[PDB]
Design a binder for this molecule. Sequence first.
Ligand SMILES: Cc1[nH]nc2c1[C@](c1cc(F)cc(-c3cccc(CCC(=O)O)c3)c1)(C(C)C)C(C#N)=C(N)O2
Ligand SMILES: Cc1[nH]nc2c1[C@](c1cc(F)cc(-c3cccc(CCC(=O)O)c3)c1)(C(C)C)C(C#N)=C(N)O2
Ligand SMILES: Cc1ncc(COP(=O)(O)O)c(CNCC(=O)O)c1O
Ligand SMILES: Cc1ncc(COP(=O)(O)O)c(CNCC(=O)O)c1O
Ligand SMILES: [Cl-]
Lengths: 442, 442
Amino acid sequence: MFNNEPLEQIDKELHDILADEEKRQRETINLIASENLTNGAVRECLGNRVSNKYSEGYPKKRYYGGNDFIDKIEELCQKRALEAFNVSDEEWGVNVQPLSGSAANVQALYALVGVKGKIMGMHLCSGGHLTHGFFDEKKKVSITSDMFESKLYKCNSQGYVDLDAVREMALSFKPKVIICGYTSYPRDIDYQQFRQICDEVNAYLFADISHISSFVACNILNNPFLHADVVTTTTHKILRGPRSALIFFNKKRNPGIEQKINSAVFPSFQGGPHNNKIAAVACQLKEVHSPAFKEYTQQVLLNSKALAKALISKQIDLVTNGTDNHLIVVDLRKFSITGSKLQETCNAINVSLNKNTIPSDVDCVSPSGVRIGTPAMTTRGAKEKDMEFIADVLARAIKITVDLQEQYGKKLVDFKKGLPGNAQLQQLKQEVVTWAGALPFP
Amino acid sequence: MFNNEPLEQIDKELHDILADEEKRQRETINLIASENLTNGAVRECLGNRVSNKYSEGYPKKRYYGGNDFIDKIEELCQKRALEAFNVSDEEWGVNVQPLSGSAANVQALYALVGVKGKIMGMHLCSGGHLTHGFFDEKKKVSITSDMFESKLYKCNSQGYVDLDAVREMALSFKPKVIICGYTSYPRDIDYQQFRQICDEVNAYLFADISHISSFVACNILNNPFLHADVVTTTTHKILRGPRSALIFFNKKRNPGIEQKINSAVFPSFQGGPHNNKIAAVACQLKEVHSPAFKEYTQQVLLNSKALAKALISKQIDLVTNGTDNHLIVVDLRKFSITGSKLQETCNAINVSLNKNTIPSDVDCVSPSGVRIGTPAMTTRGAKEKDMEFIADVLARAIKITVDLQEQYGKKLVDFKKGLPGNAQLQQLKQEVVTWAGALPFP
Ligand SMILES: Cc1[nH]nc2c1[C@](c1cc(F)cc(-c3cccc(CCC(=O)O)c3)c1)(C(C)C)C(C#N)=C(N)O2
Ligand SMILES: Cc1[nH]nc2c1[C@](c1cc(F)cc(-c3cccc(CCC(=O)O)c3)c1)(C(C)C)C(C#N)=C(N)O2
Ligand SMILES: Cc1ncc(COP(=O)(O)O)c(CNCC(=O)O)c1O
Ligand SMILES: Cc1ncc(COP(=O)(O)O)c(CNCC(=O)O)c1O
Ligand SMILES: [Cl-]
């Protein structure tokens, strides 16, 4: 007693928007630093009937039965995770149930410190995440500033983590956790000096590596597993998995952390796991290990360096004047345009990027930069030589944005009136569409 | 720069476990009251490239551009949800972003009462959910007993909600929220008398309808939307959608509830929405509104009554001596077997059901019942006449469980040594596999 007609027949309305979404993805220069494109195999997992199964609890300790095959999938995913991130199943554990990155962070944080717990993380404006304790004078914007007592450290005027300030703050505040690992941070992290500061005040070291996961796994960047008590990561950004998260915990340094973290995920926060996610994650974690994927990850970095260099060659300023990873933040102050204006201009030419604060911004109200990254376009087959074109297109967008602001004014509502029908944008869009449309697409 | 080999080629190890899982689902009498089988259209959505898109925020107030198509899908989902549950978009709003039922409840609760907030819900042992404030002497098991202050009300000795005790507790405790709607409650709910008690103490009325959503939608059971401030529901149980949740809020009764609920979901708790889920939810909500799906839902209740009646005809006791909905709780005390023992016996014959507390159970440690329900089997085409066979199989399983317990003892470790190789269980398993394997399977 069910309708088994395919999606096109059963729901034509939805199926056209979805076909449109796909065409837009295929015809866009996607520079969102947090985005990627999943292969067909990962997407076969996500639509697999294994999502029909309720399996509350952990493998070999389920509430229900009929979880024999589900248990093999969850155990295969955990094994593959610890293998991908070069850790021994004796010293490190992993939970594979968190539904997304923000959930994983709130759960892991709760496990370590509990309600009223004291935490330290990077401010949102300086490249921190929302789940690192973000609040505002007006509101406790994240639950992590409300269910916990959070304090927020900043980057210096040049965009680097200011470790002297982390330490001065830690010694007066005395937190149980210090969060490092970030959302829009263009450089590698000194986990060792974080591990030193945490020892000095007796705090846990929490590394959110969601944006740089692949670099950590492939030994291209610093390894927080040498120093961290907890490592969290999403599986959907540079790692190229589905939308999910992973919480790692150091058993050796903290006996009794395994149960704390596991019980935080369930039953403290979640109910039934989504087994299609876990399947999809298992599938991707196999790829992550392969030497082919290390090639991909290296290519992401090569592309990012080349893109930084090309933008500098066109007299565009970058926060920290470069990058150690997949991401760049462009400082837009010398052109007198906001990030939101350039995001609008770039949307009109099928260039996906986001507005992003820079060190000089006191507030998140008017961000004076944009963030770009190479993982999506590296996935689609772009090499170092193609980064000049991307740098060319972004430079042209900045100029057009300056022209449009000149003609229609600095108010955003007034600015956007210039965008529709602009001859140069239609021209620039067409150049983007022709180049992006052709590229390999999973 | 990606591998596009199909799942079987790229990952043969995983594809075997998955095909095995599928075979077990196909060959099983699934009586888990919270499970169902999604159609092909819903699974096409879950595996759609729309999950590639980062779209933090809400439609027309996104952080990023490139979200024109995502905004249509999210707007279509909300529209179809208000329509499906017969509510006016003028009077009622809906958030479609929560990743799952437990998340939806923690988020909606936070929105209403904040940290340290006072909440009342049904005890887990009486049929409440974990996210309704469940704690123990030993631990605050759910976050909803820790980030909130919770008190728990019980059902009476006959298994019904005891309203006199709910008022008794509410007047002295004075919570800001009272939760009703349950995980293993076999009867309809008197939302009107909940509304009357909430008004008396100035508390919000929270209705979690995840198990009975379809009945509410199709006007077969009482309508909590006439009385409640907030209604939450999962989309994966009787509703037959993907794994996701919906939070409904009553604007008319509570102006400014829209923002608190929306801000609670993002950015307080979650980050990026899972657009594949939202697509999948849209797809199912269209089916939910059809007359064909009301026919399905009616069939679920017919099957449940017929199953209750056949179990009573075989001298098996049911909590409340019947059901108004899709679910039955069997009281096993007269056979002197635990729920876990019959759960094990039923797994051995490919019968999926769960152990479940009954009113006489003081603890959740040794539950004296099992819970069954008809949605899954009703989806697979089973009619009223087929319920006699299911009651026949369960009666035989109870007898074998009594036999095995006699032979091997009442310790669970000992009992299970009896299960493998049992001639009657192999015989009963084979009968289950022959009938279940034949039934329609989406
Ligand atoms: C959308 C989002 N999620 N997590 C982020 C962001 C970023 C962001 C950028 C931005 F311009 C604004 C925000 C933001 C998101 C939610 C709430 C707020 C508070 C400010 C307000 O309510 O106006 C700001 C957040 C970007 C990656 C998009 C961000 C920055 N800069 C950082 N560090 O992390
Ligand atoms: C697994 C689960 N999730 N939500 C539920 C359950 C149910 C359940 C049954 C059961 F036998 C035990 C539990 C349970 C789950 C988590 C923690 C606890 C505390 C007991 C302990 O730590 O041993 C009990 C929960 C069942 C629907 C499966 C339940 C009951 N009875 C109720 N009311 O709701
Ligand atoms: C450090 C960090 N942690 C967690 C998350 C996100 O978890 P969700 O799966 O809940 O979105 C992000 C992505 N932040 C958005 C971006 O970089 O574009 C992140 O940058
Ligand atoms: C009232 C209620 N609320 C929420 C949930 C579940 O939300 P998740 O999507 O987080 O599992 C359940 C399912 N409880 C398990 C069962 O009935 O089998 C439930 O019964
Ligand atoms: Cl999913």
